[PDB]
């Protein structure tokens, strides 16, 4: 994910942002200058654009077991594939020799790593002093009032990060202390030797069942990862045990700080060599993290829609034997290693990547819906069902169709964040609406309806996004061309050319009408949504009438509508300064990972989904890392 | 299937009609203009010709054992010649044999029955939401003379007006299902992968996995037991809404069957995910071939309508959700015809219904065509017509289609599947028709029962007009000339049988009925088509006498005395279609939307006739099964 | 046997059929079209032919020990030949070192595998709902009534598959549970670890003595395979023990279903790597399975004659040590492996191969008897005693002489299905006959007699059978040629030409007379038996008189008897559709076996009889696989 973020703008920028919330939402502000050069008369207008985001969500999570991955053990303990070298293990150690015939090796700690990630982010948020239940923004446009419900009330919601479980009200895993060389039960054991006492306590107690107490998307409900397990440690750690039996009071046993929690993460991962599984965990957390708050009224359907996540069941063989984590670690992906090094250099790469993936996902789904019609795209590709069926490649396909670069795959099989109710282009949403005054809006029975996925963000977190083959507002610059034909009342225009002209005029300060009435563009973002009527098929020409001016006008432009006054206006848009408000630039040359004691493979296996998906000219598809 | 409808791209386009039917039947209107060119000037008549089709049928189903096919499996485990690589799947299994003995031995992937069930449910729900789903009712034949009325197993008026679930709650058992996400299969049992389906679509799929109760007389509501006794589905979320409805927890109101769009999306998602293009192609072929029959406008024509078809739908088996990595990779040797036909159906679902309408007419006409072309109007001495394609039940419908129309009939693309009529293999097959008591006029009624030999023509060719059924010019060709009689005598105007029928048809269109000897030309008003009389087929005769040509009450374009010299003029007849519309109670398609998905799909145009990937071609020597080339 | 069945017709067909019975007999129907092209006038006649089969038989089985075969152990545990590598075993493990000097290694489980095969087929038959005692058909031809006796009466015979043994009325093997690494007694032990509890129970209890309770040929009597043994399993299984001591009632302890029985078969074979021994077991079961019901009256001598089977005594060393079944399995025949993969893909390959081998065996014996005389064959080969003396190559020699392809050998030494009373050409049979009306029949003292072996089937399960070098009805097509000389009353004809003419005329619908009176051909099969008088020597010419027509006549043909009207009639016969009635096509590309972890040898050793026998021009003989 490091390559994706560092390639959205340029290899030199590498701009990162920290987590911030304000009752569950935050706003990312920008400052952008737009040019207008025509007849060697360069004009410009500098303005600020704001795209706010919300961390409130209610994703659905299913905990279903999957494949077993052993890409962290020594070379001699692995065969030519991911399967362990059982003969080597036994020629090293009996009853176990006969027992092994009945010991499946299901080692997959992705659920644990994701749990630690969300707990760390929650603790960072509460030490930042703004952790709360989280509430959706209340959007009101003079004509329509909307307010999506949330389960947990913010005011009564907790302000401090409590432990996910309860006071012994629910059962807890039967943990144990392990120091021998003989695994006694096929139940998984962990190896937490480098961890300190408090880190081990946090790990074991958070293994227990998690309860959802806030509307935060990373606060989803999760059951206990394993009913029984043991940890291979030098000493027994039992402070959390005193807490469950009802001895340690809340004040002395509180969730550990962010620094120690991140340290426990680091120790766990780089002692068990879980770089691949942690990369998968970070990918899933980034894809589940947050959604943008829509400026337009109909964009709230994106907020109401809930993702579906498939986290594999927890299993471990690392702690079963102590020599497995020794030796030379094998089959570690270079992308996973570099991503791990970067995220432990700065732990907010996940946050900035999550915001970028949210914006890219929304725009990719919407542009798939639009480019189905034939707007901007030459080839009538199978956008509907091509690479969006594969749940693991769903969000990556959306990112590829939006941005055009190689979206990083989950790196793990049978894990995905998927919107099942979004593959169809007929899917509707009933957003609650208390209409203030009647206007142009498809308001039927107190809820307007939307078709497919709407726009809820603006392509400003990722600006140079190459959505279309030709120049467009999504691209850096475009040239407004002559109309197809001019008439008395106006001129006809192609779908894309008309939208480009309307966008440029809205930035300049002109309101643009059309027939077969307004090009919508909300203030505070000044990005013109694609018109609903032109979105559908059978419409190839747009009649532009009445290019009127607005109350506030910035750049004064020719008519471009009358043949006499049309001029080849060439525009150009560049983003200058961004600052979230509820930098931190990274340096690749200082975060390079540890190549020693690690065997690194550049390529991956398509079964395990170690690759990327790129929007080819002939159609987007999955490709190998090679 | 698409190429057959488009007649191999008639101006790169064709036309389709959606399914619509009232009381189990629907008319199929037409408007044509028939010319008459004599004395170097042209007369014409514009008349509306209709055709009645019925969805009612009672085919005999046979869910017997069938072969397995692994076409939608990744390219690295299948192979064109090396076939299934069991070494590769054992390696990628993650000892090996310890998994072999459990489940890795069967390899019985076949979902044809499930796809057919989903398709018929889609059709039934379409009829339901169009306000036209009801119990079937075969029309009656009122003609003043002998009248025919047939019974129905379920009464129409008491018949249900709403498509409820096929199975009946609290009467029969259901397959035992439970979500399964384990990498390692545990029990040898069909595992079907439904991961990307929504809750309602996966619910609909697993509910249609159950057994099917017939609640109507329609031909696509045939009985079907539960496809698998036990099974498990690969899905992230455990779905039990169907299970709740199995018990009393969920009521009938809250588990109504979904809309047609939801079932269509479920079918699209299933076939796209599992790469079931060929299997769905076979399912669509079978369902269309059993869809419907044309209601005759003649008396002896109902004998064809009495017959019931026998279908070989293979027993269900799914090995695609056992291993997640089976579908990871481009599909193996998917037929190009299957891909294009799948894209066409998903774009326009009415293609299956239109192809069914075309196939019913083509088959009913081609059975008559073969019963005649075997003897060649009785001037063929030996048995060197090679009609043996009619023998094996699989190429029955295909051979009938190829014999009726010169186009290559599409093979079923699957082995041990067919739609066949066992008792009509031989052309000397007698059938009895229950008949009401009315005085006769030469309908050879025996014991108050029409005795019918062979198979009768029951439909007009107006939906496939360029049929080219016969070699010579004729009404089937559309344009023909009427020549002078061979020689004139007292009885009058010796005519060859085929030319006599051509003259009779043209005169009946023009408003003159004709009298023959060795007596008239009983035809239909609504459908001014005159079906070929038995003197053409019998082959005992080679010349026929036309005694008098009289004027009907409904006179039309005026002609001279054709059956006499010094008065006959060589009129010529040409007809063109003005407007066709299938009403009851259209959607243009061109070859622009045919473009199939070729991203990550290995496509082979060639096929092997062992698996029935070809097309039967009619030549002058006879029929012949030809591969896909 | 897969190559034989798939080569009888063509590599593409591969047609298989399931087991079905109707009071012990079933009928296989066909639909065949016969052509008659002459003077460019192609005529044809389509008709159905039915050849019924019977599963009732009383074979004689002798349980005599033979060679010890060790072609399933690892490479290091075997020497350059089948003998085990005793030095390698001992340098792996003592008293055993001294004990071994007195441990013969007799490992041969063919009797066990055959017992499981017959039990599985019986359970399939009873779950099909038609299992019974089985009764021979009662054939009656208006002139003669015959009904062969059977020991068990069908009506009182059991309808459900009971366990072969009794209620502790007979003694049972003293089984034991083994888990150590030390074999305590030279008594054999088995290794049944992958088997479940019920599969182990079925295996051990069916090891006990088998009792014949029905007239079925696969229900032959067999004693207990071993008085003592032990099974190497994780746990003791004793439900069948409770059954023998008289505790578990019949209802809870019933014979396992077909699926679990086949699963036990699969587990046993592919864990002990008994592919060769199982191939031998399937061969023997196929050769013993069934016989055809004869349409002609004198053909019932084939029914009365009983085969002789030599099953080796049961012995096992697989369960003695647990490491033997590990490693790389050695010396596995490719034919055996592919046959095993096919039969576990579909378990009815054995049934279809058994029906084919029955038809081929009868026709091969009869054609050996006929071709002794000189009918059709040029060389007076030693058909009487050449390759029919070797009991193991008896049935294979019959198949080779019939069909002409390579009959698959038993793949095991000192095992055979042999008819000792059939090598002579003078062997007679006294079939019981209640004669209805006197006619042409050699009826002496209430029993007609037959000489040698008669025809009891028709070559329709295997049609393209190349019995003779020249064209014939057994071949696809033949041309009726001009007579040697024409006389006033008729024309003379060679033996084979006269029989070809008579067969063609009977298919057409003409009855053919001859002198030095009728060419017999029964309806429902319309295949003309070779005339008895022309069968013997010293007769080279046949006088054909009076080619009269029949009651039902299909194809109208020239006289072919008078020189004026003789025409070069060319016939052609093809089979279109078959359907047994008391398909299932196989696909070779999907049933390919597991080549990994198995060492496969194409060639075999003539001592062990790993080969095939082909009818060469100069004479049939055994050849190697090479």
One DSSP character per residue, B86-123 reads: HHHHHHTT---HHHIIIIIT----B-HHHHHHHHHHHH
Distance CA A397, CA A365 (A): 9
Neighbours of B113 (CB within 10 A): 26
Residues making up chain A, counted from first to last: 626
Q: Which of C471, C403, C411 is nearest to C624 (CA)?
A: C411
CA separation (Å) from B79 to A373, A424, B394, B575, C117?
37, 34, 26, 52, 33
- What separation in angstroms does the CA of C335 have from each of A287, B96, B106, C600, C606? 54, 21, 20, 9, 15
| Residue B598 touches chain C, beta carbons under 8 Å | no
C23 touches chain B (CB under 8 A): no
Interface check for B265 against chain A (CB to CB < 8 A): the answer is yes
DSSP-H helix ranges across A404-477:
none
- What residues have CB less than 8 Å from C129, skipping those under 6 apart? none
Which residues is B41 bridged to in the sheet? B38
Inter-chain residue contact B382 with C41, CB threshold 8 Å: yes
The closest CB to that of B198, out of A413, A421, A609, belongs to A421
Set of chain C residues whose Cβ sits within 8 Å of the Cβ of B65: 18, 583-584
What are the residues facing A479 on neighbouring strands?
A570
Which of B88, B92, B94 should we substitute to test contact with A (largest number of A Cβ atoms within 10 Å)?
Answer: B94
Instruction: Test B392 with C577 for CB contact under 8 angstroms.
Output: yes
CA distance A508 to B265: 44
Helix pair C110-127, C197-207: axis angle to 10 deg: 110
Please give the C-alpha separations between residue C360 and each of A210, C5, C348, in angstroms, as whole numbers: 72, 11, 18
**Chains that contact C by 3+ CB pairs under 8 Å?**
B
What does the alpha-carbon distance between residue A412 and residue B95 come to, in Å, rounded to a whole number?
24
* DSSP secondary structure string for all residues of A347-403: TTHHHHHHHHHHHHHHHHHHHHHHHHHTSS-SS---TTTSSSSSGGGHHHHHHHHHH
Say yes or no for a CB contact (<8 Å) between B101 and C585: no
Q: Do B97 and C597 touch (CB under 8 A)?
A: yes
Burial of B340 (0-12, 13-18, 19+ CB in 10 A): buried
**Structural resolution in Å:** 3.2
Please tell me the distance from the alpha carbon of residue C500 to that of residue C493, in angstroms, as a whole number.
Answer: 10
The 8-class DSSP code of residue B265 comes to: H
| Chain C touched by B547 (CB under 8 Å) | no
Shortest Cα distance from B441 to chain C (angstroms)? 36
Of B198, B261, B328, the CB nearest to A420: B198
Domain made up of B1-629: CATH architecture: Alpha-Beta Complex (3.90)
CA distances from C415 to C62, C306, C376, C395 (A): 10, 17, 33, 12
Q: Do A67 and B324 touch (CB under 8 A)?
A: yes
Cross-chain Cβ contact C596/B87 below 8 Å: yes
Nearest to B235 by CA among B289, B272, B273, B263: B273
Residue with tokens 């079933």: C26
**Residue B160 structure tokens:** 């249900």
Q: How far is residue B395 CA from its own chain's centroid?
A: 13
Separation in Å, CA of B104 to nearest CA in chain C: 10
- CA-to-CA separations, C267 to B387, C344, C561, in angstroms, rounded: 50, 11, 65
Question: CB distance from B484 to chain C under 8 Å?
Answer: no
Tell whether A426 is within 8 A of chain B (Cβ). Answer: yes
User: Choosing among B69, B98, B382, which should be mutated to test the C contact, i.e. which has the most C CBs within 10 A?
Assistant: B382
* CA gap B427, B447 in Å, rounded: 23
Question: Cα dist. A158→A57, A214, B295 in Å?
Answer: 17, 8, 74
Task: Find the CB nearest B324 among A83, A386, A414.
Answer: A414
Please indicate if any CB of chain B lies within 8 Å of the CB of C266.
Answer: yes
Q: Do A66 and B324 touch (CB under 8 A)?
A: yes
List the structure tokens of C553: 């006549």
3-state SS, residue C206: helix
**Superfamily (CATH) of domain C1-626:** Major capsid protein (3.90.1840.10)
Name the burial class of residue C279, with classes exposed (0-12), middle (13-18) and buried (19+) by CB atoms within 10 angstroms of its CB: buried
The kind and range of the H/E element at C27 are strand C25-38
Beta-carbon separation of B599 and A308 below 8 A: no
Q: Which of C170, C36, C77, C22 is nearest to C505 (CA)?
A: C36
Under 8 Å CB-to-CB from B534, ≥6 apart: which residues?
none
Report the DSSP beta bridge partners of residue A614: A621
A390 touches chain B (CB under 8 A): yes
DSSP C187: S
* C44 in reach of chain B (CB within 8 A): yes
For chain A, counts of helices (H) and of strands (E): 14, 26
- CB contact, 8 Å: C257 with chain B? no
CA distance A573 to A357: 22
Chain A: touching chains (3 or more CB pairs < 8 Å): B
Of C586, C589, C596, the CB nearest to B83: C589
Say if A82 is an interface residue toward chain B (CB within 8 Å).
yes
Asked if C590 and B107 come within 8 Å (Cβ–Cβ), the reply is yes
The span from the CA of C104 to the CA of C558, in Å, is 74
Distance between CA atoms of C145 and A623, rounded to whole angstroms?
A: 78
Asked if residues C448 and C442 have their Cβ atoms less than 8 Å apart, the reply is yes
Question: How far apart are alpha carbons B190 and C371 in whole angstroms?
Answer: 53
Across the interface, do A67 and B183 touch by the CB < 8 Å criterion? yes
SS (H, E, C) C502-545: HHHHHHHCEEEEEECCECCECCCCCCECCCHHHHCCCCCEEEEE
8 Å CB contact between C348 and C584: yes
B169 touches chain A (CB under 8 A): no
Q: Does B325 touch chain A (CB under 8 A)?
A: yes
CB of A410 closer than 8 Å to CB of A399: no
Helix axes B350-373, B396-404, angle to 10 degrees: 80
Helices then strands, counting H and E runs in chain C, come out as: 14, 26
Q: Do B391 and C31 touch (CB under 8 A)?
A: yes
What token pair was written down for C34? 């016969």
Q: Return the biggest CA–CA distance within chain A.
A: 96
- DSSP class of residue C623? E
DSSP codes of every residue in B591-610: TTTT----TTEEEE----GG
Chain breaks in chain B (C to N over 2.5 A) after: 94, 518, 585
Dist. CA C309–CA C220, nearest whole Å? 11
Helix (H) or strand (E) holding A241: helix A239-244
**Measured distance CA(C355)–CA(C357) in Å, rounded:** 5
Residues facing A575 on adjacent strands: A32
Burial bucket for residue C352 (CB in 10 Å: 0-12, 13-18, 19+): buried
Partners of C600 in the beta sheet? C332
**Residues C16, C584 contacting (CB under 8 angstroms):** yes
Breaks (C-N over 2.5 A) in chain C follow: 93, 516, 582
C-beta atoms surrounding C226 within 10 Å: 21
Show the tokens assigned to C132. Answer: 């019974």
| Nearest-Cα residue of chain A relative to residue B237 | A62
Q: Is B149 touching A (CB cutoff 8 A)? A: no
- Residue C500: partners with Cβ closer than 8 Å, 6 or more residues away: C471, C472, C473, C478, C480
Collect all residues of chain B within an 8 Å Cβ-Cβ radius of residue A622. 600
Cα separation, A460 vs A8, whole angstroms: 11
Query: Rounded distance, CA C159 to CA B347, Å?
Result: 56
User: Is the Cβ–Cβ distance between A462 and A359 less than 8 Å?
Assistant: yes
Return d(Cα B414, Cα B606) in angstroms, integer: 15
Check if C594 contacts B (Cβ < 8 Å). Answer: yes
Contact yes or no for B269 and A621 at CB 8 A: no
Tell me whether strands C443-444 and C417-418 are parallel, antiparallel or unpaired.
Answer: unpaired
CA-based nearest residue to B373, from B621, B128, B115, B572: B621
According to DSSP, residue C607 is labeled T
CA C132 to chain centre: 21
**B162 CB contacts (<8 Å, ≥6 apart)?**
B128, B133
Query: How far is residue B275's CA from residue A325's CA, in Å, rounded to a whole number?
Result: 41
C-alpha span between A613 and C38 (Å, rounded) = 68
- The secondary structure of B170-224 as a DSSP string is TTS---B--B---SS--SSS-EEE-TTS-HHHHHHHHHHTS-B---SSBTTS--B
Picking from B277, B271, B315, B328, the residue whose alpha carbon sits closest to that of residue B108 is B315
CB proximity C550 to B under 8 Å: no
Q: Which helix (H) or strand (E) holds A408?
A: strand A407-408
Please spell the DSSP secondary structure of B411-427, one letter per residue: P-SSTT--EE-GGGSSS
The token pair at C155 is 């009506």
Would you call B437 an interface residue with chain C, using a CB distance cutoff of 8 Å? Answer: no
Number of C-beta neighbours around residue B446 at 10 A = 10
User: From the candidates B201, B232, B599, B600, which should be mutated to test the interface with A, based on the most A CB atoms within 10 A?
Assistant: B599
Elucidation method: cryo-EM
Closest chain A C-alpha to B238 CA, distance in angstroms? 9
B158, two tokens: 């008491």
Give yes or no for C271 touching B (CB within 8 A): yes
Chain A CB within 8 Å of residue B68 CB:
no
* A67 with B94: Cβ contact below 8 A: yes
Which of C262, C264, C275, C585 is most worth mutating to test chain B (most B CB atoms within 10 A of its CB)?
Answer: C585
SS3 state of residue A63: strand
- Residue of B179, B195, B265 lying closest to A391 (CB–CB): B195
- Calpha distance A426→A453 (Å, rounded): 9
Q: Is B93 on the interface with C (CB under 8 A)?
A: no
A79 neighbors A162 (Cβ within 8 angstroms): no
Closest by Cα among A225, A333, A199 to A274: A333
How many cross-chain Cβ pairs, A to B, lie less than 8 Å apart? 78
d(CA A75, CA A73): 7
Integer Cα distance of A450 and C55 in angstroms: 71
How far is it, in rounded angstroms, from Cα B580 to Cα B50? 9
Please say whether the beta carbons of A217 and A59 come within 8 A: yes
Provide the β-strand partners of residue C560: none
* B96–C589 CB contact, under 8 Å: no
């Amino acid at each position: 994910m490091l390559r994706f973020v560092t390639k959205n703008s340029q290899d030199k920028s590498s701009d990162l942002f920290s987590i911030c919330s304000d009752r569950g939402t935050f706003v990312a502000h920008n400052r952008v200058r737009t040019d207008f050069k025509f007849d060697n008369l360069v004009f410009n207008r500098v303005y600020g654009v704001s795209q706010k985001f919300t961390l409130v969500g209610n994703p659905t999570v299913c905990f279903n077991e999957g494949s077993s991955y052993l890409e962290g053990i020594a070379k001699k303990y692995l065969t030519l594939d991911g399967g362990l070298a059982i003969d080597n293990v036994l020629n090293e150690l009996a009853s176990h020799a006969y027992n092994i015939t009945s010991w499946r090796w299901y080692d997959n700690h992705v659920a644990l790593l994701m749990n630690m990630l969300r707990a760390y982010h929650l603790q960072v948020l509460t030490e930042q002093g703004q952790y709360s239940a989280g509430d959706i923004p209340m959007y009101h446009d003079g004509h329509v009032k909307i307010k999506l419900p949330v389960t947990i009330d913010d005011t009564a919601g907790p302000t401090q990060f409590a432990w996910p479980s309860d006071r012994s009200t629910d059962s807890y895993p039967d943990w144990a202390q392990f120091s021998e060389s003989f695994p006694s039960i096929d139940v998984p054991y962990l190896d937490v030797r480098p961890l300190t006492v408090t880190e081990v306590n946090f790990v074991l107690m958070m293994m227990s069942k998690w309860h959802r107490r806030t509307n935060l998307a990373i606060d989803y409900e999760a059951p206990q990862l394993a009913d029984k397990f043991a940890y291979r440690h030098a000493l027994t750690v039992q402070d959390a045990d005193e807490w469950i039996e009802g001895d340690r009071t809340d004040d002395q046993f509180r969730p550990p700080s962010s620094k120690v929690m991140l340290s426990a993460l680091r120790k766990y991962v780089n002692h068990n060599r879980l770089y691949n599984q942690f990369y998968t965990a970070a990918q899933l957390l980034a894809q589940i993290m947050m959604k943008p708050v829509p400026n337009c009224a109909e964009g709230y359907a994106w907020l109401m829609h809930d993702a579906l996540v498939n986290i594999p069941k927890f299993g471990s063989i690392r702690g079963r034997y102590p020599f497995l984590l020794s030796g030379d670690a094998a089959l570690i992906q270079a992308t996973a290693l570099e991503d791990w090094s970067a995220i432990m250099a700065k732990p907010e790469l996940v946050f900035t990547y999550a915001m970028q993936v949210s914006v890219a996902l929304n725009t990719g789904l919407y542009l798939r819906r639009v480019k189905k019609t034939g707007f901007g795209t030459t080839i009538d590709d199978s956008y509907e069902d091509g690479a969006f069926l594969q749940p693991e490649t769903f969000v990556q396909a959306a990112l590829a169709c939006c941005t055009g670069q190689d979206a990083p795959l989950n790196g793990m099989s049978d894990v995905y964040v998927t919107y099942p109710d979004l593959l169809e282009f007929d899917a509707v949403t009933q957003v609650p609406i208390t209409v203030i005054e009647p206007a142009g809006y498809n308001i039927v029975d107190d809820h307007l309806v939307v078709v497919g996925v709407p726009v809820a963000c603006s392509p400003y977190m990722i600006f140079p996004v190459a959505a279309f083959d030709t120049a467009n507002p999504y691209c850096g610059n475009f040239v407004i061309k002559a109309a197809n034909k001019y008439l008395r009342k106006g001129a006809v225009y192609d779908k894309l050319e008309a939208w480009k002209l309307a966008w440029a005029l809205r930035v300049a300060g002109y309101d643009t009408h059309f027939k077969v009435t307004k090009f919508y563009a909300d203030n505070g973002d000044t990005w013109t949504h694609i018109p609903e009527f032109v979105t559908d098929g059978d419409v190839m020409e747009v009649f532009v009438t009445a290019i009127e001016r607005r109350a506030r006008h910035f750049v004064e432009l020719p008519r471009l509508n009358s043949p006499a006054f049309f001029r080849s206006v060439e525009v150009s848009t560049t983003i200058y300064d961004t600052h979230v408000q509820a930098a931190s630039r990274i340096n690749l040359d200082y975060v390079k990972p540890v190549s020693t004691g690690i065997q690194v493979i550049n390529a991956g296996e398509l079964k395990n989904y170690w690759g990327s998906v790129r929007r080819t000219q002939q159609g987007l598809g999955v490709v190998g890392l090679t």
